[PDB]
Each structure stands twice: as structure tokens, then as C-alpha cells.
Amino acid sequence: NNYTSLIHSLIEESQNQQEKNEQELLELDKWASLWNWFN
Amino acid sequence: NNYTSLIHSLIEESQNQQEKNEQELLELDKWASLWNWFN
């Protein structure tokens, strides 16, 4: 019934994946913007 | 620039999504807590 500990682990996993996906998206934007500074 | 709003449209959609998945995980946390408090 350890479900409570595991469910909380899933919650954290869900947040680690969103935060990295978003991080990486803003990496792209910085680069694309520096890139468009020349184009 | 339009890569920027596109990046943001994907950052927003990734937020809403992550929040829905967290809500369905919270609802599972409710049922495991109910399971527990009974028995």
C-alpha cells in the first residue's frame, strides 16, 4: 500500500521531466535569437 | 523571431499538461490514503 511513497516519486519524476524539457526549450531560444542577430 | 512564440507556445502547453498529470496523480494519492486509513 506503499502506493503513497511511490505516487510521490511519480509526482517528482513528472516535475523533473517538465523542468528539463522546458530548460532545453529556452536553450534553443537563446541560440535561435543570437543566430537571428546575424540574419 | 517567430521561433520564440513557438517556443513559448510549447512551454505553456508543457505546463498545462504537467499540471493535469499531477492532478491525476493527486487523485491516486487520495485513493491510496483512503486505502490506508481504513485497515
Side-chain angles (χ1 to χ4, degrees), chain B residues 3-31:
Chain B
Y3 46 75
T4 302
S5 60
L6 280 164
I7 272 153
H8 294 320
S9 277
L10 287 179
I11 291 169
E12 196 174 25
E13 180 189 70
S14 107
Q15 292 172 341
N16 300 349
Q17 265 307 126
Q18 130 71 191
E19 161 110 283
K20 292 164 67 277
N21 288 309
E22 188 170 315
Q23 212 38 61
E24 145 235 283
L25 288 166
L26 294 168
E27 299 312 70
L28 297 153
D29 171 284
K30 178 174 84 168
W31 291 103

Side-chain angles (χ1 to χ4, degrees), chain A residues 1-19 21-39:
Chain A
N1 329 228
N2 209 286
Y3 317 121
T4 271
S5 180
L6 298 170
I7 294 157
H8 175 249
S9 251
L10 303 183
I11 291 178
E12 200 173 301
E13 171 55 309
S14 190
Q15 301 161 342
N16 303 334
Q17 296 181 7
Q18 139 100 26
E19 157 250 316
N21 297 325
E22 154 158 16
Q23 246 288 143
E24 161 176 81
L25 286 164
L26 299 171
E27 254 44 273
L28 198 60
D29 175 58
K30 221 147 215 127
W31 194 94
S33 306
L34 227 185
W35 180 84
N36 221 160
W37 172 288
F38 300 93
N39 283 276

